[PDB]
Structure formats: structure tokens, C-alpha cells
Amino acid sequence: DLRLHLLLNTSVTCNDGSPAGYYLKESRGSRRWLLFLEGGWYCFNRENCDSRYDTMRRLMSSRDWPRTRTGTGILSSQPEENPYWWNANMVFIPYCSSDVWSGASSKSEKNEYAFMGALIIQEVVRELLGRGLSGAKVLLLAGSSAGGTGVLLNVDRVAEQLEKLGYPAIQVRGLADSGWFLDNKQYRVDCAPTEAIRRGIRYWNGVVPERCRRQFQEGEEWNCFFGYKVYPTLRSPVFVVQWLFDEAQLTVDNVHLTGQPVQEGLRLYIQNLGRELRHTLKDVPASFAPACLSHEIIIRSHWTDVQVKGTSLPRALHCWDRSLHDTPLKGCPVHLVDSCPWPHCNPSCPTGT
Ligand SMILES: O=C1N2c3ccccc3C[C@H]2CC1(F)F
Ligand SMILES: *[C@@H]1O[C@H](CO)[C@@H](O)[C@H](O)[C@H]1NC(C)=O
Known part of the structure; x- marks a missing residue:
């Protein structure tokens, strides 16, 4: 279990002014620290943030947070569940700023909500x-x-x-x-x-x-929220995990897969989406991109199951660790992008069960 700590600096708040925080499991004698950012969409004006506050309040407030959470997937401390970093110090940072972790604004008499994700x-x-x-x-x-x-x-x-x-x-x-x-x-x-x-x-x-802000400049910073545009500006090593047919991507593309038969136009659309992801990852040396219709991987308890070209994500991350030791590694790859063109053409895709 990871234990809640509310921030001692109470100026750094969730949307409603309640203090933000983090859940921590320490591992003494480990010098590895994993800090995980929760997801959960965002809100972007008064009305849709008000709606979110009604029915997704844990994503806007710490008032009702439990004092512990169970680490799962890459946040698990059991080697059986987490072959990669089971002995690391584990931190889960709840997403309560609804700003894709970008905000630097306090709740005030001008602002009904605080958006402090970056802070x-x-x-x-x-x-x-x-x-x-x-x-x-x-x-x-x-x-x-x-x-x-x-x-x-x-x-x-x-x-x-x-x-x-x-x-x-x-x-x-x-x-x-x-x-x-x-x-x-x-x-x-x-x-x-x-x-x-x-x-x-x-x-x-x-x-x-x-660096990304300097490229796109004032008024165009929205570009930096798109990975293939912001990644080349970054200096820190970044490993990119992305389903080729991500469910949230399809949702914002107004694709609602119904179980009904897929017509030619939608088939071409989905295949072209997978091709465009694959293209954006061609020059990302550390990546894991299976040909599945799914969403999120790394804190799922069965995150070890999916493989690309026979290599699981925990293995790829371990290979990444080796590659950053102070030339490719024999049989320990870090760039793993499926080339097959339809969801679940990879047999190891999540079943959805
Ligand atoms: O994180 C998410 N999204 C996001 C972030 C930056 C750029 C584009 C998007 C789509 C949206 C889906 C989400 F809510 F899953
Ligand atoms: C609390 O956080 C704010 C925002 O980053 C910062 O300006 C302020 O100095 C912090 N307070 C303390 C006591 O560190």
C-alpha cells in the first residue's frame, strides 16, 4: 500500500482549493524513484468543470481521498506483478487539477478553480x-x-x-x-x-x-500537448508507450466502434490512424506500441502480458535501463512498434475481459 501525504505547502491545491498530495511507499536501500501521474481527461471552462465537480470530484478535490492506495502494475512492489522496478520507491500523484498537468493558476476572486498541475x-x-x-x-x-x-x-x-x-x-x-x-x-x-x-x-x-514554447510561440502553445511535436524538443530520456489504436484517440476522432460491421471508409480511417502513429514513432528510440484497441497500460495488474515482437513492456523498460548505463543490446530491444495494420492483429492484446 502507498500512504497519502497532503502537501505541506497548502498554496499548491487541487481544483477546489483543497491541498494536493501524493501517495508514497518507500523502499530504503533503493535509489530508484518512480513518480506516477494519474490521468483522467480534463475540463476547460466553467460549465464543464462544474459538471466534472459533480460526478468526478476525486479528480478535482482531495476532500474524499482515501488514506492509502494499492500499488498495481509498475507501482506494484511484488516482482511477480512488476518485473521491472518492484523494489523502487513508489509515488502515485493523484490528478486533481484537470489541466493535463500544465496549470499554474490559483483559485482567486478571478478564478473559480485552481489549475496547478505543473506546480x-x-x-x-x-x-x-x-x-x-x-x-x-x-x-x-x-x-x-x-x-x-x-x-x-x-x-x-x-x-x-x-x-x-x-x-x-x-x-x-x-x-x-x-x-x-x-x-x-x-x-x-x-x-x-x-x-x-x-x-x-x-x-x-x-x-x-x-524549447517547445519557443518554437510554436505565443498563442500556439497547444501544439506542445501533442507528443510528436513536443518530444523532439525534450532533453530528458523519454520512453513512449502508445497503443496504435488508442481508445481515447478514437473517441476524440468521433469513432464509436459498435460491434457492427466496419465499412470501407471506417476501415481505411482506422488503418490510416495506426499508420500515422507508427510513423510518428519511427525516430523514437525507446517506444512500445502494440496494435491493439485499448487505453493505458502501465498500472494495470496484467501489464506484463502484452508483447511486441515477443518482448513484453517490463522487459523493454529493463532494456531501456541497460541502454542508459554509462550500441544496441543483443536480444534486449527498446524500440518495439507493431507493423500489423488492424486492432488485435497482435495476439497478446488485452482481451477486455
Ligand atoms: O489525455 C487525454 N487527451 C489529450 C491530451 C493532449 C492532446 C490531445 C488529447 C486527447 C485527450 C484524450 C485524453 F483525455 F485521454
Ligand atoms: C508554496 O508554493 C508556491 C507555488 O510554487 C511558492 O510560490 C511558495 O514559495 C511555496 N511556499 C513555500 C513556503 O515554499
């Missing part, structure tokens, strides 16, 4: 330094869905934080799961990701990585 990450890191993070050799900032996009937006800022706090020896790395989206045309008010993100950044006072 929550920095404050968690700061308070962990006194809990043992000061002794770390590797800090892996991981995340799923909106949390995976959050990794891309924040991994280099965590690296700069630690460098400026005087810890240049801590190697910061990113693991972005299911956060690599395409600003493609839809198959056919509440949205095209580009337009919703555009509005969100203004509403959240969202921040993006500096």
Missing part, C-alpha cells in the same frame, strides 16, 4: 527530497493518459528543478503511457483536442516546455 509536480518533488529523494540515482516520471501527456510537458522541468536545487546527479527520465495523441481529422461543445486544449491553456494558465 503540484514541482511541489511533490520538493517535499520528497526530504523523504529520501535527495539520495536518488534515477527519478522516473511516469504517467498514463493525461498523465502521460503530463510526463512530456513536465519531465524537463523536473530535471531543471533538481539541477537548480543542487542535485545534478539525479538522472531524470520520462515514461509516457497513452499520452501520445494525433491532431488528425475526425472520422466525423463538450471536442477536437486542438480546440479544447487551445481554450484550456488560456483557462488554466497552462505552461509548456520552454
